[PDB]
Amino acid sequence: VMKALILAGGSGERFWPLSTPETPKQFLKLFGNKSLMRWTFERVLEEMDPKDVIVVTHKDYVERTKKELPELPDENIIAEPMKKNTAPACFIGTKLADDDEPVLVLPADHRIPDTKKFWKTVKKALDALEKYDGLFTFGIVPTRPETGYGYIEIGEELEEGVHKVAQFREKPDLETAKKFVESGRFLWNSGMFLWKAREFIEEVKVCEPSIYENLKDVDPRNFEELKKAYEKVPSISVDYAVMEKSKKVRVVKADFEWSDLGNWSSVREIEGYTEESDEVILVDSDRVFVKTHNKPIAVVGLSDVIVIDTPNGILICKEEYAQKVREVVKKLF
């Protein structure tokens, strides 16, 4: 018995001009002519019947989620009355589970190309969960001194590849980041989780009563009932809400390619820089990421720049400012 909980609340904001307010990150077909969420759903379906998968997302997103995931029973989609981040989503998704049922929590907007190593790692976490209880996160083995991700400090070892979490650390300085990688004592917080339903519910009661009392006996499908609760409930990631507080947090080492797809630079990391070609002309310009639409694009005198041309517009972004594409969406709409 196992439940999968897909959290799908993102913003394509950093993916303008490809993303539109009407199309959040989760529906973007960045790879292979399928959305991030679809890939994620298919990843899960490798080892699970869809009866045990749950999507927690806004109502605006619900209908297109049905057309994206025809296999998913309409009941298993769970409409949210407002964006209050992952912690409340996690909570209402977890209540569908039975007390001693494992709940695997997954963002809809990440990329994990090896579906088998993913399940190898999840099986390992399931076995560990049964041996030690507590709340489990997945730490990705860093392959570069990445400043864009948050980190998990390895603690005491229970078993090979399963550790207590000594500490969480947010985006570090490049030197600090380089020390984290060289050390081998830090992992990337993948944003993925695994816990037994009952244990998480109880853990929130101490960490964030705010969340527990208001959602305690609210039926998550009853749209109206959940609105009042949500009006009462704060905005706060479960990372901040529970994980940063509990004394029973473990990490499982994940040996697989993973990305949060944070911004356009993240896509470049996966794809590599763009090749000079008949639609991309480069003169004294290196390390450029260019997605063309229907006309040639020439970049002259500029290095480390992202250029995206879609019908919604054209973006031209120095690479390190790829997080500030959000501001474009703020100013534009």
Give the annotated binding-site residues for Mg(2+).
109, 260
Judged by DSSP in three states, 124 sits in helix
Identify the residue among 9, 17, 142, 191 touching its own copies (CB under 8 A): 17
Asked if 21 interacts with its own copies (CB under 8 A), we say no
- Write down the least CB distance from residue 320 to its own copies, Å: 7
Task: Find the DSSP H helices in the chain.
Answer: 36-44, 59-68, 86-94, 115-132, 174-183, 197-207, 209-215, 223-232, 238, 264-271, 325-332
Q: Which stretch binds its own copies (CB under 8 A): 39-47, 116-124, 177-185, 317-325?
A: 317-325
Classify the C-alpha dihedral 312-318-323-327 as positive or negative. Answer: negative
Asked if 305 interacts with its own copies (CB under 8 A), we say yes
Q: Which stretch binds its own copies (CB under 8 A): 96-104, 133-141, 170-178, 308-316?
A: 308-316
Asked if 325 interacts with its own copies (CB under 8 A), we say yes
* Paired strand residues for 54: 5
* Paired strand residues for 159: 162
Asked if 332 interacts with its own copies (CB under 8 A), we say yes
Q: Which of residues 241-300 bind its own copies (CB under 8 A)?
A: 281, 283-284, 295-300
Asked if 331 interacts with its own copies (CB under 8 A), we say yes
Closer to its own copies at the Cβ: 49 or 278?
A: 278
Identify the residue among 82, 174, 270, 314 touching its own copies (CB under 8 A): 314
Cβ contact 40:108 at 8 Å: yes
Nearest CA-CA partner of 171 in 143, 140, 147: 147
Provide CB contacts within 8 A for 175, sequence distance 6+: none
Closer to its own copies at the Cβ: 2 or 302?
A: 302
Asked if 301 interacts with its own copies (CB under 8 A), we say yes
Separation CA 317–CA 166 (nearest Å): 38
Identify the residue among 16, 118, 180, 195 touching its own copies (CB under 8 A): 16
> Which CA distances in Å does 174 have to 148, 152, 154, 177, 182?
10, 16, 19, 5, 12
Nearest CA-CA partner of 236 in 135, 89, 77: 89
Asked if 302 interacts with its own copies (CB under 8 A), we say yes
Residues near its own copies (CB under 8 A) are: 16-17, 281, 283-284, 295-302, 305, 307, 309, 311-321, 324-325, 327-328, 331-332
